[PDB]
């Protein structure tokens, strides 16, 4: 006999635990409780702070959310107005010395007039193609050239897209991207370029909401917050370090000993193989690949620079800087960093320069969030990454030399991306299966693995959709159908479903 | 205040009715009922009998079952291995003096060389055009002969499907169909013709199973038997007259009244309309192009005939015979038919001429099931339509002019097959929204109109899913995405779900 | 016994029947006789000259040889280097207040941007769909839109063209226009488009020579006066008014008599089969079509206008203009002209006006020569077509409203193209072999009615292979083989061959 | 001064020289004169006979004439009607124990019924892709492939091709074959595969003419037989040791010099440059291919067998048989063997045993002729091939083990194909040019090279083009354009000529 026993026990607190413990919660029928090694819950979508009060996020974190369900518990987190921001998808590629609006191919009006031909030849070879194709392409790299040409394919996707996943795109399966037909739109891209019309994907109705305080972090601490703490076990004194799944017993760093009947896990599936000692599912585990990633974090003094505007996040496909994506998160709530009456010293200028004068200066201050990718094809050295990112910031123009920056932020984070490879499904379905013929619902981004399904709403609909397949016999929509849940708008399931309202009478 | 009030009321006793029940007696949550005009359930899923003691299914009623959901109900009505018998699923096509076994493309070799060479030239044609083709037929027609060329759709899906749908091929939709690319295996079907093969697409893996007794109708009456009787009303006593959707009660034949939160409505959509004497909804509903059905049975004297053999089902694409379909329902149970000892006097010879002997003499016996459809471009003499039919078993050579009917039967039913025109989508995609915000999920074959997902477990789930999205908030997945449930194995939900296994502890 | 016998006769001292001659001079074997109704020779590659000194051809006449022979007779006729001039094939096309390059294609970035998406969007369409091709097209319509897409064919080629042929493009063939694949540069043309770049289809090797005297006219009395005058009958007394086929006798205006062995006619065949009295054939030539042209020339005072530059022949697919083609004729030769110190009073103003003075001023003066086409879908008033041409040249700014003109002429050419209609061929192929069987050579522009091989050089050697075949059993390449003779350059036959270097041993 | 002086000198007396001697004796212009190192005219088209009495023509000889002048040459030289036999073109490909039909694609029929399929499998694919073919073929194994697909490339033109030119398919150019698409007629192939047909592409208008008497060689012995004989010298005599290309000298054997102005050279180029001491020439026609040919001729005791019939020659792809081609001589006239009253011992018997009795009897006798092709990729053992052949003749059942053969014959031709290899025209146009700058026109079947071309017909007119060119500026069409002369009927060209026939009157 365990020293607890539920009925459904989650591990993990991040988005996608926290998804099946609110379903759990709203439900009421079986008992549950919920597990995470850290005292604040969010996992990945958690926020940090420097000394200076500068908050980062795990890197450029934007909610676009495609479930009515994730929105009532938001909603339900965080009821005010003045909870949230409002703003516009903005979002640039640096390429030859210009910011072109994303998608790059509708904008490269930008270009000189020779990249323009040589572009456009690209696609018009891609559009013939096309025509006559009668196969799918197999590999990302495949799915690049058929639908972009090799010209732009080589100025932006390719390198960009090493610059993230950390392997080459002839490595990626094609799949995640969605069931989009693999061909240019030859003559949109045509128009803008005889035009000399650039375009952006964003406006009016296409925008995000980011939480007023506490970063991406601030969501999932009030979300969190909804449930009974009782139910909860949130630190070291809820780390899972064995999982017996034969004797369906869960223990933890402490001691304790938790009988369930079934489980939701959401930490790494390679993780919760070592911590089942299962030696089968530890050899198939190593298998995936994933991307660490590498977060850091720049404070700077002064009002916004008119270069920087408005922008919100920002891709890097050249070789002049490490980081493939930067976030200028002061933009996403004025909370992210200090008021202007806050006194900072500076420690450095961006030319890597640091003054004598200890003198602490008022603001205002403005913040920049960069990312870098590491893998075993992409090895990042941890201890000259800040500067080599500063030096990133100076050469793509979005620091002046003489800028002053008054805080710093470098965090690394092992597990950050799962990679889609080649070989990626043929292992999850030696993995998931088998975890499931034991009672084990592994989901989330690293509890199943699937990038394509594997931001905040998927995750935490991942969760919910989990214990909905447990209790109700639910279709697990997100984990085998993400064409299908990504094409629509899911509207069905509520926070408050018929069963409550019938109950409640 | 009404003479009864339930949370959700259900009209309707066929399979989806009998599907939203089942659902809503295993959840056990929200109160609810159940009525039917007719005492015994089924709907069009019932069996009629003779007086002489031949059934009737309405037409041939063969099970295929997506979903496991469907399979435990059925189990559970019928658990004996007695209760059931299985079959191959063997069809062929009357064409040309053949029997050609299904699919008839596959087997044309049974035809005349010179009109093997047409058929293959024209699939040629087919097979070098789809190489090329960057649209999607907009028309059934154009579906069919992208599919098999000019040649084969001529000799059987052209002018089989007029029969069937009673109006042209060229006025139907074709996305019902499915997803499937419209191209030819040419390379099947000349290989077939090369080696003189024939194959149809049934073997021991392709069956179905059928009552034991009562013919469809018997799995229907005793899935019925597991509601709590106190739960329905069938016969006239549930016979619904009035809805009043403004104030959600429901008025029936005997004048009882039922108020409702929510109502599922499986009864033919345009009666729905009329009932609620809203006129907007009438003027669209008859706007719904369908044909009627008329079930022609015959039952003959004799041992089952060699040249019938283990035939199930059968298709008639030619001119010589009104029928579109016969079924040997006296394959599907020894019990569809009397025993071999009972007596019955011959009626008439298939030719039409008297008998030589009036008297009563045994059997055994055997069973043929009819149906020929009815529209407003293809009218039927009701007054001579049942020996139309027997001249066209006499022509189809399936009866010789001496065999002996012991047995006639023929029935006309109104709503028979909803039509996909090219129209449909456009007038439900104005009638469903209205009803739906109306607390009114209407479904069924004529609840909601859709042949593609228009079998009884179909049906069934339609009922099951609408109860589930009422009380549970999940997807109306068999209602909106047709191709979704057609394409997969739907296990998950069952009628034992987590949530019993859970309150019964 | 006729007046006179020969060999071989040649009927018509165009450049046709100048080609049979001087093939026959220089084989100087069967006896032979050439005979024409004008005491000028030259045919339609003659030159007028207005009493004010101002030359012009019988429209533009560009010479592009592809023969040896041909330059050898040429360069015998005309030796001296000041003989001659060298331009640059300068042209251009009239459009939208503009003066576009040719080929317009590939100079469409004079256009505004909208209408060049216009225009690149229809040839984006034309590239895919000639990527599946496989058929060829089978009207000149059809030829022109799959190499250009809509938008550029109704710009350029479509009305073009029936300015030109005055038949619409839809009503001829295209086998004329050679071997060509009918499909777009799609690349060139969007590169040009891109770069914002012109360029015409010339340069310093892509030139002409023409004659520094006479006009085109020179070139033929010059090659004519290398004949033995005694086989000559050039005038009055030289006009064929009979020809009896089955006596193989001609009859000349002056009731002179000949007598031939072989007949070689170069006078447009639908005459021939009038002077034959050959009911048969006068019903089969009426069969082909032809249009008539109107050559209008002007004489304008003043050096040569900076707009006008260097420009040698222009399109005018517009409808502001009758003509379909102008030539700025005093820029082939300085001779086409008075000199600047020959004094003229000016006749009109461009806009129609009186001038101030009517005493005669000096020059420099420059030429405009203009073609207007004619037919039965065409009509051409003959009383108002100079001033109409004059108000066109206002219309498309060659001329100010100031612009004083010193010099107008006009003439209508009954036999100016033979048209390449559909129907050309088939009733070719009926002609020719009839006549062929008499031992007629009919052969010409208007002998043999075929514009692709209608140039000056094809004429010539259509002369000379007629005659190579009587004597010496060679293959009419030039007259069957259209794309043979056009895709080479011809240097076998010579002046000088070896049968002439060994005679003279 | 050299001994002897012409205008033109023609080295070689086969058909190519012959042509070029019969066009010069027509011109009666330049003198001229004709040598051969053979007393016997003929070359390669000359006819050996067996101590026995067999003739054996250097493999199958069968004349298609393209041209009028041929024929006329052929008629003057056996005038009577006597003088020749007329014969279907009957052929056939041994394949899998059977004779199919040639063409081999159309007669598959014959074959086993899965591997039918396997052949329309493979076209199929052909098809499918030549739909969208939008490059030409670049090898002969290339077009094969894609003419015929996989399945049937294999059975024949793929193994047939490669014991015929002695190099792989791959190693040869593809232009040679004409300019017909590379694609299949799935119809017709399919079309006879399912009617069960086969069908030979011969009949009474498909037809050729072989001589009486003499073999294929008796036709240049007459045609040579018209020259006026002081202008031969044929024999030792007449054989060519030296070419002095700067001096225009020729020398000859017994120190003869023949002095020229213009030389048609026949004989094979790779010797021509050697004769000429050109370092150069030599370098370069050694990097042409040929291979040799084995001709083996077998006489056989009795009447001809039924299983051979009237089959004319016959291909054989397969390994059990060493030749590509046999002929049955012995169709081709009854005077290629001994009558039937000649008495002949029996040699050996087809088994390779000894006969039973050595005593001479009679007839009547038929006759074999095989092709064994021979080159540095595909050697031959000269010592067995004999033998070899005659064992082929049992493996493919033309011969019964106990036939009586009564003669054979065997010779090794050193040039006997020039093979079109990928390398050819690359050499040629360095070769042909360099020695046309030095007045030599090397033409024939190893003059020029070009197999195309190389078959008696085009041999005899490249001699007279030669002429016609150096005389009369003719273009020499065979010799630069094959697809052109074998396209059309050429009818121009005839031993009476205009020239002729204005000369006597």
């Known amino acids: ?265 959401t930490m790494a599936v390679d993780f919760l193989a070592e911590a089942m000692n299962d030696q089968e599912l530890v050899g198939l585990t190593k298998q995936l690949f994933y991307s660490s990633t590498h977060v850091i974090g720049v404070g700077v003094r002064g009002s916004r620079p008119e270069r920087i505007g408005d922008k919100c996040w920002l891709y890097f496909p050249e070789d002049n800087c490490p980081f493939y994506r930067a976030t200028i998160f002061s933009n996403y709530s004025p909370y992210n960093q200090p008021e202007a009456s806050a006194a900072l010293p500076t420690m450095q200028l961006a030319d890597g320069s640091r003054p004598q004068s200890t003198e602490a200066k008022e603001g205002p201050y403005w913040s920049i969030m960069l990312e870098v990718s590491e893998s075993s094809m992409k090895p990042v050295n941890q201890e000259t990454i800040l500067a080599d990112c500063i030096q990133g910031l100076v050469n793509t123009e979005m620091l002046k030399p003489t800028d002053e920056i008054v805080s710093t932020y470098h965090r690394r984070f092992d597990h950050g991306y799962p990679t889609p490879t080649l070989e990626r499904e043929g292992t999850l379905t030696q993995i998931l299966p088998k975890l499931q013929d034991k009672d084990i619902w592994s989901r989330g981004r690293f509890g199943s693995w699937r990038y394509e399904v594997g931001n905040q709403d998927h995750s935490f609909m991942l969760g919910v959709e989990a214990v909905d397949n447990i209790v109700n016999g639910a279709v697990e929509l997100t984990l085998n159908y993400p064409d299908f849940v990504n094409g629509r708008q899911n509207t069905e399931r509520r926070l408050v479903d018929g069963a409550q309202v019938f109950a409640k009478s």
């Open 1 to 265: 006999h365990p020293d607890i026993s539920v009925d459904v026990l989650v591990i993990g607190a991040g988005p996608t635990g926290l998804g099946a413990a609110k379903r759990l919660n709203q439900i009421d029928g079986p008992s549950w409780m919920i597990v995470d090694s850290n005292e604040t819950p969010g996992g990945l979508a958690s926020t940090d702070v420097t000394p200076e009060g500068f908050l980062y996020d795990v890197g450029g974190h934007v909610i676009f959310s495609h479930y009515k369900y994730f929105d009532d518990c938001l909603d339900e987190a965080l009821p005010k107005e003045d909870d949230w921001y409002t703003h516009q998808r903005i979002s640039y590629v640096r390429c030859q010395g210009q910011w072109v609006p994303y998608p790059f191919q509708n904008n490269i009006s930008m270009l000189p007039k020779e990249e323009q031909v040589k572009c456009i030849d690209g696609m018009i070879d891609a559009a013939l193609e096309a025509r006559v194709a009668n196969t799918k392409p197999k590999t990302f790299d495949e799915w690049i050239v058929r639908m972009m040409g090799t010209g732009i394919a080589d100025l932006f996707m390719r390198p960009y897209n090493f610059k993230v996943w950390a392997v080459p795109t002839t490595k990626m399966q094609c799949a995640w991207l969605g069931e989009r037909v693999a061909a240019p739109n030859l003559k949109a891209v045509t128009t803008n370029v005889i035009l000399g019309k650039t375009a952006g994907n964003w406006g009016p109705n296409a925008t995000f909401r980011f939480p007023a305080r506490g970063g991406t972090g601030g969501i999932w601490i009030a979300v969190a917050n909804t449930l009974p703490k009782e139910k909860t076990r949130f630190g070291e004194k809820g780390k899972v370090t064995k999982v017996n799944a034969n004797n369906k017993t869960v223990t933890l760093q402490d001691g304790t000993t938790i009988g369930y009947k079934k489980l939701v896990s």
